[PDB]
Amino acid sequence: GSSGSSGKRSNSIKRNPNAPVVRRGWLYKQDSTGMKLWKKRWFVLSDLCLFYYRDEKEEGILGSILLPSFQIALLTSEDHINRKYAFKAAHPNMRTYYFCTDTGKEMELWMKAMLDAALVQTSGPSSG
Template sequence: MASLWRAATGQTEKPNDYDGVEFWLNPERTGWLTKQGEYIKTWRRRWFVLKQGKLFWFKDSTVTRGSSPRGVIPVASCLTVKGAEDVLNKQYAFELSTRSDTMYFIADSEKEKEDWINSIGRSIVQHSRSVTDSEVVDYDSNK
């Protein structure tokens, strides 16, 4: 996942302030997912928090101001989020892809998988850098 962060931001280190996102307060979505490690390809269960265009993960579900995320993915750099059961041959699997990397996750149920795909998909659209406010054309303003 670190390579995804580097690829998405051009940074070699993960930030320790997480752009001021208060991940412990009123997240958009939280829950357990199983994710594959970046270097050692084992599957580990992690607590995920989606907030303000960032997907954080932690070792346990007790997330406080003092918690330190194990990793973070800026979803604005992601291109797609979709089911991946056929790719991994695992039930409730989905993938999150950037131009250079693809990460895989496994939810606990079909509903959880769909909820995560929908939430992350919405966040990608909301935080995407492909369309900024200045580039949005209001076709109704000339009427």
């Protein structure tokens, strides 16, 4: 006979190469821990989700980000960041992210897409 017992104990995420990538470029992200600075990294919009790597090489993913859980909305008075033409993403199980571009277009290309993933109505916890 045979025996399966082959599962994934750790709930990890894997990118789907097939999943027609919408657009991938060097986006600037800002953190909310002490100093609000911008970090240059390689981002990618595929599978209605967010994925980035050390560099263009895309050698192994450092961490994935679920857009469907994030809320894309135009900055507000409170978030009067000098760097205009930028947006922010709110998360329930996480903090509020911030993304900005060089021009208005570079931003529209990210929004039009990102939103397509955020708008999604999927959210739920899990045992682990």
